[PDB]
Amino acid sequence: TARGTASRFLTSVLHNGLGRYVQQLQRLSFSLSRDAPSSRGAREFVEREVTDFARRNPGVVIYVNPRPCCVPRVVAEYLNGAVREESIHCKSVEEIAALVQKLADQSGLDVIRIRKPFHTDSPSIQGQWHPFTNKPTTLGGLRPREVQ
Amino acid sequence: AKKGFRAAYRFQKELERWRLLRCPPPPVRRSEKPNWDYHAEIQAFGHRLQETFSLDLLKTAFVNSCYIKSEEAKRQKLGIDKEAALLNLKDNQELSEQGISFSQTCLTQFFEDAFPDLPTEGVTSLVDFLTSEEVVCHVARNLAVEQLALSAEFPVPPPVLRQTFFAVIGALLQSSGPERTALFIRDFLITQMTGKELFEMWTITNPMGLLVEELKKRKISAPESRLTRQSGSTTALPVYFVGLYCDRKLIAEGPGETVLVAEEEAARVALRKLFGFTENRRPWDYSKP
Amino acid sequence: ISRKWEKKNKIVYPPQLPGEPRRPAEIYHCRRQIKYSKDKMWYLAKLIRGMSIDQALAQLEFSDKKGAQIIKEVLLEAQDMAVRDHNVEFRSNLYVAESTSGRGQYLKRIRYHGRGRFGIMEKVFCHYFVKLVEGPPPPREAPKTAVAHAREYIQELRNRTITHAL
Amino acid sequence: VLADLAIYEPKTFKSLAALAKRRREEGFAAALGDGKEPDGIFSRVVQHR
Amino acid sequence: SSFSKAPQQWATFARVWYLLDGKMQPPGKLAAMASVKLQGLHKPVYHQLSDCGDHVVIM
Amino acid sequence: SQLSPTELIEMQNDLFNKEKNRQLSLTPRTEKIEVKHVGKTDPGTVFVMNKNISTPYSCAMHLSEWYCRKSILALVDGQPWDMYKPLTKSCEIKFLTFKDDDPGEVNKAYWRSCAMMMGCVIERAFKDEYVVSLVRAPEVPVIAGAFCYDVVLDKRLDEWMPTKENLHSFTKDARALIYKDLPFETLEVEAKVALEIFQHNKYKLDFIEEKASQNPERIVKLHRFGDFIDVSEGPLIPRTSICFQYEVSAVHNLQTQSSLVRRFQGLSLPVHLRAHFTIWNKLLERSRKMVTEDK
Amino acid sequence: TYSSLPDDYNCKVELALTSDGRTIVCYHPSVDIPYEHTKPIPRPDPVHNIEETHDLVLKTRLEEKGEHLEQGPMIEQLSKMFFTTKHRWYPRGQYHRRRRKPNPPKDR
Ligand SMILES: [Mg+2]
Ligand SMILES: [Mg+2]
Ligand SMILES: [Mg+2]
């Protein structure tokens, strides 16, 4: 719920996409088991896809660890300092691929309610309404009952 | 008793979470953590910024004095022979100096070209601001420079980080032309100027005086403060709008709680019109000439 | 049961680098399983919070509650502990950081009624905790002046934003 | 969008209001006029190209 | 348009004092505009959780 | 010598700090002196203290806050000691209170302190243009209805006597002085470095000269609180906060052949002894009359 | 020489229709406030706190202002200042002070 959780305004990290676009995902770490069935998809993914993925994204460093684990995870890590954990446990090659893509294209900002869909510095070009902006000025600048 | 591993293990995780909540562990270098290959990291830095560096020059750029002196502490305390290979390290001092000098020059030129009416004191203030401790550290740490930098004391105190950022700039200046580096500077520094004011970063304390001097320079005479709009004078929350007039034309105008505050505002506004630092002003150009 | 408060006195800090401000002493002390009620105890323990130790001793000295003398004894014990075991000059230099009442383990008894009904009665016990800190007592906060309220209100009006506005 | 203009673009909004007022007056003019010949400048209906 | 932040915000949410003559007016039609101006419903910046409302002086 | 009002303050305070740090450096170590307690109350009590560091106030703190608040003056052997004056050798200590049976010593001290306060209040209450020379604090008995301070003023100021407004201003400033709680600090000095502090006040230098003249070793007794320094006879009360009711009553012009000297009379009472509003008004009425004992 | 709205205030507004018909253009330059419509800045500065005899006493006379009231009357005065009802000025319990966010989000 919205009163329940935290919230943030819509932002970019380091004004991304203004001057130039910087892919925010920094590194990607897989942990899987050569033996265990739970990791099956994750193995296939490492065989076929990882290689190609690594060419498609030169800027992300990908660490693959075979180790004896029951639950294969992928740890995304971002320029933001943000660390996002995921479980590739018991998924297809297809599913993992889609997941790794989501990770690739995310900002690394926290996922919470976003208060409003737009963010503007200087929304106000040509003025910002104030009580006097549409009022006519009088002669001498007298108040309503003021006499001179 | 209940028979199973599962809930017990799963609870061991909760125990660890609470342990980390009540005593937070002091922040550790990304280098001393499980997945690290320094080389691959460096290459990725370069590729992700869409730049081309000499790996020798960059690896040089992330080296600091402190890292070397601490390395000499570890060298001298264990009785090891390092000196040749360790003093071969070629620190980043040089690169950082070229970097800061060029960046200040570059920036200064950018502003001078964009705001012809900015007094030299102003453009100086601006370059000072975008080269500041705060801004540069923020940007550097968000580009994973703090990640790669070799230094004692992991939080990497701000002067070291400024050093290291501009070190990378200089490394770029050697690796590629002043053109390329000018683009990098206008992308990762000048953008921190987005949304900001003039007098947010300039800090000048007497707007009226400065205005009068600038109008002497423009051969205009005597700004006269003339009260324009007001609501409640007797209230605890009055509003004044003071206008500034030169030969009965209105140059600029401002709001405030007090007539003095407002007069000062009208001054700041006038200044902002004269100098062409304004809200309506043309947004910066990001383009490929 | 849980005995924690005691062990708080067994903590050892790392020595102070010269130039750093001198760390004020802290003495934790308590009395377990007093025959007072927990609540009646609370009033007392509340009274003496933030008082300099001598002031608290004076106040307790003249109260008529049964708990008054218990608390007083605990305070004297804590004072002597502070000068003897921890290193504190000026046994008058302590103020009461924390004073509180926890509940103990209760005995359970019968209370006879009439028409052969009974209530179930509880012989009550309680704990008294205290923590003494070396120094003068921290200053009691004055209520907000008209100036303070006015500043806050003004600041609030100034925090306003055009809402749902862009 | 209209509300946001009203707040953050008081000029453009006064324009829109000027337009609307003009179009209305044009409408009354045409209804009172009782003829097909006049087409007010702003009462003309454009088709897509 | 170019103001500092504080004076800008102050100008926008500023209170205003309206004067309304009552002579030979139905108290209802009076109370209508009085009501609008009290709630600050004449301000494009209106919201129910902003304090905005203006003083009205009826004579 | 061309000097601002703040520069005199600065020089005097820096001289005082120099001297105090010299006295500090004179004692090489932490030396242990054994103080005994001759008080009627907790007999046989022995304090083991740091020589030229520990004070009889720091002594009371081993007993209870009660001494700390109730004890104005500390009798060491047969002599009155100021509560913050560091103990020199091993000795015996007794504490002295306002409600004690033979308070006279304390009373004197209290009076002196108040006088000195007024002195400060006066010196800084006049425009920079004029010249305010504090003279001395003539020692009156306390049966005399007030305490007083002698002050000479700039020659162009010689015609006016103050208005209840101005007097009430002096009082307001004295109360301002009480509010912030300043310890009275003491130092023993040699006349050579004593005269260098005061300088520009002639009368001060004369006073110092006589005061040092009656003592074989040329010792002058200095007291200071906040930024204000003055020479005085005998010990003072520990804190400024000790005063509750305070008044600057009235001034009286008294003239020698060689000088025109204003005598400021004021009246005060400590929190411990504070007197009812009516009683206070009567005492205040008597404190308006000229009080003369210089000898 | 016709506009639907008076040019007294805000902007002078010009409404044109492109010869094509498919675009409306509006020219609206700001309207500045005429000199004759303004009144001179009120200037009030007076210092009587000065006593001719003692002026460091005079500079201490401006520092001589302060006062203290009770809860109730303080609140009445406060609520007369800002034209509020009395209620706003009373405190709030532990429970409400504790749920105010420590660090609220910031826009702009
Ligand atoms: Mg029976
Ligand atoms: Mg029950
Ligand atoms: Mg029960």
Concise account of the structure shown:
The structure is cut from a larger assembly and holds 7 protein chains of 7 kinds. With 148 residues, chain A is an alpha/beta fold. Chain A has helices at 40-56, 93-105, and strands spanning 7-8, 25-32, 61-66, 73-78, 83-87, 113-114.
What brief labels describe this structure?
part of a larger assembly, 7 chains, B: about 290 residues, mainly alpha, three-stranded antiparallel beta sheet, F: about 300 residues, alpha+beta, five-stranded mixed beta sheet, 8 helices, about 35% helix, globular, binds magnesium ion
What does this 3D model show about the protein?
The structure is cut from a larger assembly and holds 7 protein chains of 7 kinds. Chain D has 49 residues and is mainly alpha-helical. Chain D has helices spanning 2-8, 10-33. In chain D, helix 1 (2-8) crosses helix 2. Chain D is elongated. Chain E is built from 2 helices and 2 strands, in the order αβαβ. Chain E is elongated and about 45 Å long. Chain F is globular and about 60 Å long. Helices cover 34% and strands 25% of the residues of chain F. Chain F has 295 residues and is of the alpha+beta class. Chains in contact: A-B, A-C, A-D, A-E, A-G, B-E, B-G, C-D, C-E, C-F, C-G, D-G, F-G. Chains A and B meet through strand 2 and strand 3 of A and helix 2, helix 8, helix 11 and strand 1 of B. Strand 1 (224-231) of chain B pairs antiparallel with strand 3 of chain G, so a sheet runs across the interface. The PDB classes it as ribosome.
Assign the structural class of chain D, choosing from mainly alpha, mainly beta, alpha/beta, alpha+beta, or little secondary structure: mainly alpha
Spell out the helices and strands of chain F N to C.
HEEHHEEEHEEHEHHEEEEH
Described by strand count, sense and barrel closure, the largest sheet of chain D is: none
| Total number of beta strands of chain D | 0
* Radius of gyration computed on alpha carbons of chain F: 20 Å
Distance between the termini of chain D: 25 Å
The strand order across the widest sheet of chain F is: 2-1-5-3-4
Largest sheet of chain F: 5 strands, mixed
User: Please, how many helices of chain D?
Assistant: 2
Structural class of chain F: alpha+beta
Shape of chain D: elongated
How do the SSEs of chain D run, as a string of H and E? Answer: HH
| Terminal residue distance of chain F | 36 Å
